[PDB]
Every structure is written in C-alpha cells, then in structure tokens.
Scaffold this motif. Structure first.
Motif, short mmCIF file in Angstrom:
data_model
loop_
_atom_site.label_atom_id
_atom_site.label_comp_id
_atom_site.label_asym_id
_atom_site.label_seq_id
_atom_site.Cartn_x
_atom_site.Cartn_y
_atom_site.Cartn_z
N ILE A 7 0.81 -0.91 -0.23
CA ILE A 7 0.01 0.10 0.16
C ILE A 7 0.64 0.46 -0.03
O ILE A 7 1.94 1.61 0.96
N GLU A 8 0.63 2.38 -0.83
CA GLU A 8 1.51 3.54 -1.14
C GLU A 8 0.81 4.85 -1.14
O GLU A 8 -0.54 4.40 -0.67
N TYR A 9 0.58 5.54 -0.27
CA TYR A 9 0.65 7.09 -0.65
C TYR A 9 2.05 8.41 -1.05
O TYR A 9 2.23 8.68 -0.33
N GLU A 10 0.52 8.30 -2.11
CA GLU A 10 1.68 9.84 -3.29
C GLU A 10 3.47 9.65 -2.69
O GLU A 10 4.58 9.98 -2.16
N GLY A 11 3.54 8.17 -3.12
CA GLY A 11 4.72 7.42 -3.50
C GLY A 11 5.99 6.87 -2.27
O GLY A 11 6.73 6.25 -2.96
N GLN A 12 5.06 7.17 -1.45
CA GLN A 12 6.02 6.28 -0.09
C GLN A 12 5.06 4.88 0.03
O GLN A 12 3.54 4.91 0.09
N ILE A 13 5.68 4.07 0.92
CA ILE A 13 5.40 2.79 0.89
C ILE A 13 4.85 3.25 2.35
O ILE A 13 5.42 3.01 3.41
N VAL A 14 3.94 2.64 2.88
CA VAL A 14 3.19 2.76 4.08
C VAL A 14 2.61 1.85 4.88
O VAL A 14 2.13 2.21 5.98
N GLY A 15 2.53 0.42 4.45
CA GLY A 15 1.59 -0.84 4.25
C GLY A 15 1.91 -2.19 3.68
O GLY A 15 2.29 -1.60 2.63
N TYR A 16 0.67 -2.84 3.94
CA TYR A 16 0.70 -4.09 3.55
C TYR A 16 -0.54 -5.06 3.83
O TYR A 16 -0.70 -4.55 4.80
#
Lengths: 222, 202
Positions: A7-16
């Motif tokens: 899971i990404e938010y605005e190019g940043q990896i934030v979860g799975y």
C-alpha cells in the motif's frame, strides 16, 4: 478474502494487506492512545518505534507496536551478533473484539512485510505470550513463529496498569512516569508470570546464530 | 487547488473536505478513546451520537463529537418548538497541535456540511467556550456562529476528570454560548426571553 499487496500513499510505502484487512503506519501518539486505553496492560512502552494501525475497509480496528526489547541490548543475547537495530520485539497488539478471530495472524504476517520493506536491517522478531492472554500463543503459532523457551518474569500492577520489572526499575530513562512509579512502589501488587518466547527469522541465515546456550527451538507449549 | 467536496465510500456519504483537511465519520469507540485521553476534561459524554474525525492527508488529527445537550430536553429552551433531534450540541472537540492555526474553524465548517447531509432534521447547533480560552470563542466567530449570551457554570473535578453540575474540586467559570442556524426559518423561533444575538465579547 482478496490478494494483499504493498500500500502506497503519494509515492511513499506505508503498509501492506487487503481491503478487508491491512496494516498501515500511523502516528505514534495515536497508537499510544489506543493501546493505553484498550490493551490489557493499560500502557504503552517507550521502546516502540514502528506504529501500525490495523484497517478493515475504511475503519481502524487495531494497533501493532514494534520496536526495541525492554532492554534494547538484549537482542544479542537471543541471537548472536545482533545489534540493537538488527531485530524487533512485538511490544503491543490489540484488535477490536468484533474482528474475525483470524485477523490477528493476518495482520502480523502483513506487518512482517512492512518490516522487510521499511526496516531491512531487521533479521528476526520475537514476541511473548503468557496467561493474561492465552490467544497470543495461538496467534504466534498461526503466524509461523518458532517457540524457543519460557521464563518467569516479575510484573507490578498499580491502579489497573501493569509494568514489567525492567520498566519499573528503569531509572536511566528519565521519564515522568517512572519517577511516580517507584514513588507508589509500595502500593503496587507484585506478580510473577511465566512468559513463552516466540521468534520469527526474516533472514534464514540468522537462524544459525541462535544462542543455543540459552534458547532452543522446541515443540509448542500448547 | 484543493476545493472541498462531499466524500463517499462505496457510494455512501462519509464526510466532507479536501485532501489537506476534511472530516469523516469514525467509530464511537475510537472517538471516545481519543477524547478521554486528549481532551482537557479527560472524559467523553454519552449524549454524543455523531462521531467525526479530522484528517489531513492520510493522518487522523482531530475528533469532533456532536449530540444532545447534557439535558437533551433543554433544546426547546434555546429555540422554541425544537424536537430533541432537531438540534445538536458540540459536546467534545480536540485537534493535534501540528495543524494550521485556521484548521479548527474550517473543520467545524466541514462538520456542518456533514450534518446537513446525514442529519437533515437538525435546524441549528450550539457550542460553548470558556473565558480561560477566548481562542475557542474566536473559532466560532470565524465559523460564523452567533453569540447569544454567557452564564456562570459550576464544574467538578475528580481524578483529573471534569464533570458538569448535572450530577472533589469545585469551580465557577463563565461559559459563553454560540449558535449557528442551519435553516434560516429556525432563527424566528429563538427564545428571546432568555437568549439574544449579541456582539462578541471584546
């Protein structure tokens, strides 16, 4: 059930995870707030630095907190040649009671994906189960942790809150909580519990360096 | 730019705002947990039945809780012929420090858009501010609330939790009452024997 992914938010990896269950990073203040209110210890610990929320659909339904052991230097006592950032301990876990009883194992496995991505220096994680929550041991087995032994630990219960004896005597931290703790140390009720240690190797080569003089892979205790 | 708009999830209306600032519905247990930890009263109230979270980006940064007044029947005391579900009181609000200084008024405004969509029976809302926090009053002035008088209120403090006089350390503070009419026709029913629109305390 659907296929999990990063899971990404605005190019940043934030979860799975999946839409019906996933883990994502959350702020430290929010994770501490939920844990100290809902966790059976009624407390967070300062050594947590990975703060994960458990989400189902659009709803936050749980928290996982990973970080240092209560003594950060104890990692090299479990697995030889482990520096303080080369491992993680599961400090706190809470999921809403209305969640399916397999949600904890899914979230833990997805959290390991986050650990591999965001903290690649972590080669193994450990967790503890005891009689205050018999479900945790089942969860760790379902998450494919190995059991490497048990030990007795001393806990202090003070006004519904629970403190490990390490957290109790950690004068070196300099926390406004700890000074009040030893102040009311005589009101605290002493408890001794058996703790069952589970471990999960993220780097398979790190299994060779398990301190066999203190720990050993064994059959599950239950 | 980021203009506000209604926020949906699976077709259902869930909130209102933009990516940088919005309000959405959150669960009751999560709203109560954050409020009783972060609010100065260290307590939630059972009268709340609309639980909203404030979001900036992907992060939750605040909580607003609306519901009945402490006495749910006192609604008709303020605005005549008001059913117990024709109004809402802002029971609790908290925002994280790392937010723009205008975010609390824009959040209150977005919460009102959510009330118009999800609770169309609500014709007006009210809130209270303390004299120790004239900042909370300016927020309502920036949110286009009308000031309709003050009153001295008695509070009680026990175990760091603050309780109103509806039920130990006693307190006597000034409480300023603000109101926002969501329907213009509701203003005609204001109980001017007890409340009148007045200039802000300045």
């Amino acid at each position: 059930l659907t296929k999990p992914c990063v899971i990404e938010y605005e190019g940043q990896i934030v979860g799975y995870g999946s839409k019906e269950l996933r883990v994502e990073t959350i702020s430290c203040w929010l994770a501490r707030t939920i844990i100290q209110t809902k966790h059976y210890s009624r407390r967070f610990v300062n050594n947590s630095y990975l703060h994960l929320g458990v989400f189902s659909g659009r709803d936050l339904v749980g928290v996982l907190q990973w970080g240092y052991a209560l003594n950060p230097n104890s990692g090299r006592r479990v697995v030889l040649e482990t520096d303080n950032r080369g491992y993680m301990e599961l400090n706190r876990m809470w999921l809403h009671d209305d969640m399916p009883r397999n949600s904890e194992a899914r979230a833990i496995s997805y959290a390991l994906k986050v650990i591999r991505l965001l903290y690649p220096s972590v080669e193994w994680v450990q967790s503890f189960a005891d009689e205050r929550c018999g479900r945790a041991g089942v969860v760790y087995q379902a998450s494919n942790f190995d059991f490497i032994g048990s030990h007795e630990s001393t806990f202090y219960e003070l006004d519904g809150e629970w403190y490990h004896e390490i957290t109790m005597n950690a004068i070196k931290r300099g926390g406004q909580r700890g000074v009040y703790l030893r102040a009311n140390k005589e009101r605290a009720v002493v408890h001794k519990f058996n703790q069952y240690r589970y471990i999960r190797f993220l780097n398979k080569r790190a299994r060779k360096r398990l301190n066999t003089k203190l720990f050993k892979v064994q059959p599950y205790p239950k």
